[PDB]
Scaffold this active site. Sequence first.
Site, short mmCIF file in Angstrom:
data_model
loop_
_atom_site.label_atom_id
_atom_site.label_comp_id
_atom_site.label_asym_id
_atom_site.label_seq_id
_atom_site.Cartn_x
_atom_site.Cartn_y
_atom_site.Cartn_z
N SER A 121 -2.06 -0.58 6.69
CA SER A 121 -3.45 -1.14 7.60
C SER A 121 -3.13 -2.48 7.51
O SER A 121 -2.21 -3.17 6.67
CB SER A 121 -4.56 -0.60 6.59
OG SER A 121 -4.54 -1.73 5.36
N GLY A 128 -0.46 -4.44 5.19
CA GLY A 128 0.37 -3.70 4.18
C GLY A 128 0.85 -2.46 5.25
O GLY A 128 0.65 -2.29 6.28
N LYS A 129 1.64 -1.35 4.32
CA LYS A 129 2.33 -0.33 4.99
C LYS A 129 1.26 0.48 5.80
O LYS A 129 1.63 1.17 6.79
CB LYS A 129 2.95 0.61 3.92
N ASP A 161 -4.52 4.32 -6.86
CA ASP A 161 -3.80 2.91 -6.67
C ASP A 161 -4.63 1.86 -7.42
O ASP A 161 -4.86 0.66 -6.63
CB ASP A 161 -3.72 2.72 -5.32
CG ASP A 161 -2.63 1.66 -4.67
OD1 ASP A 161 -1.59 1.23 -5.70
OD2 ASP A 161 -2.56 1.35 -3.45
N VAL A 208 -6.01 -5.94 7.97
CA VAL A 208 -7.28 -6.10 7.65
C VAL A 208 -7.75 -7.84 8.38
O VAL A 208 -6.98 -8.54 8.23
CB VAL A 208 -7.29 -6.46 5.97
CG1 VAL A 208 -8.99 -6.59 5.80
CG2 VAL A 208 -7.20 -4.77 5.44
N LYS A 211 -10.66 -3.04 9.05
CA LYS A 211 -9.47 -2.47 8.60
C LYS A 211 -8.96 -1.56 9.35
O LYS A 211 -9.29 -0.46 9.56
CB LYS A 211 -9.68 -2.08 7.09
CG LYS A 211 -8.61 -1.32 6.35
CD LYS A 211 -8.92 -0.08 5.48
CE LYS A 211 -7.67 0.46 4.41
NZ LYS A 211 -8.19 0.80 3.48
N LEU A 245 -6.71 -11.36 7.54
CA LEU A 245 -6.63 -11.34 6.26
C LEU A 245 -5.67 -10.81 5.25
O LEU A 245 -5.30 -11.32 4.41
CB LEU A 245 -7.95 -10.89 5.53
CG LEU A 245 -9.27 -11.64 5.92
CD1 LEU A 245 -10.60 -10.89 5.47
CD2 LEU A 245 -9.39 -12.95 5.38
#
Length: 329
Positions: free
Chosen positions: A49, A46-47, A154, A51, A66, A43
């Site tokens: 993780s 990112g830096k 975040d 998913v 994740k 799905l």
Amino acid sequence: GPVPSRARVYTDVNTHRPREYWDYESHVVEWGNQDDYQLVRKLGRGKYSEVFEAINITNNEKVVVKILKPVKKKKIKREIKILENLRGGPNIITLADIVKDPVSRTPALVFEHVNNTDFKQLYQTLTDYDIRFYMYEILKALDYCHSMGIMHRDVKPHNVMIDHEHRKLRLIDWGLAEFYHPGQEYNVRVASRYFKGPELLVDYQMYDYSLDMWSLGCMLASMIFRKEPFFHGHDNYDQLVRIAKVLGTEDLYDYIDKYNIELDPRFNDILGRHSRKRWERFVHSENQHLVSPEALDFLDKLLRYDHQSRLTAREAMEHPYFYTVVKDQ
Ligand SMILES: CC(C)COC(=O)c1[nH]c2ccc(F)cc2c1-c1cn(CC2CCN(CCNS(=O)(=O)c3ccc(CC(C)C)cc3)CC2)nn1
């Protein structure tokens, strides 16, 4: 050196809890059976993780897995601890399980599934009312976590998951979140560039929950003016430039005075002199159906340099902009 600071609200929330509540370094992780889940499809990534959609072959329930990339064990313990502390709070994503691959030994978190896959279109067909409503749901979650002693750090669109078909919204990715302790000095290298608060941009480390409130304002602004990102900064220095050319520089140097902040000499040549602009200037024929006096009065009270003078989540929740949403519930 700089003048200290404390949150206006929820100031000693953690001081009053038992040590283990926030002392995540000493938390021991309840691992589980990585063989109860099977990955269906990826799905995102990112830096920190990757998913996956997944299915729990124990119960056929679809689920989100994740997989964490290498960080310090304590960073993982941190996310795990905050997620367990917040489990069950309004519009917090639910951590369901914690597993580790037997051979790889990479840890992974298992979450409730929220159906998104609709975002792009949904992003440019939200009505004025949808925005008020979903902003209210976010504030419910921010108030909860703040009252629980936790800064998200975040807040931004991609960290909100909305299944519009069931008007359901969860606040996700707690990888950057910390516990608030009065007088603590935090890392300023948090949150995406377009959402970083002035305190982070000028390197004031004794910040608090109000940092999330600034990021909400940026989210809100891009939604109502249809400008993504609102403050379109080339990097961390020019991001404070972009803010100043809207909020003006006088309020900024006042902020700097009051907290006796030491500005990076770099800013000397780039911050300039700028008057505080009226919000009307971002209103054009293609976004005005989402702009209203209440929305702008709301926005102006979130986007302040002085983090102590931004609206708190609870205070935000009371603003006129939300009278109609509150009346329905
Ligand atoms: C991607 C990793 C780097 C980190 O992942 C996680 O950490 C993660 N952890 C999970 C737990 C459970 C789970 F179920 C999924 C996940 C996920 C996870 C992450 N992605 C990818 C994007 C997530 C956000 N999408 C759309 C943006 N929000 S949006 O449209 O819903 C909207 C509408 C409208 C607004 C405006 C405001 C008024 C509200 C804001 C946002 C794009 C795709 N997919 N899943």
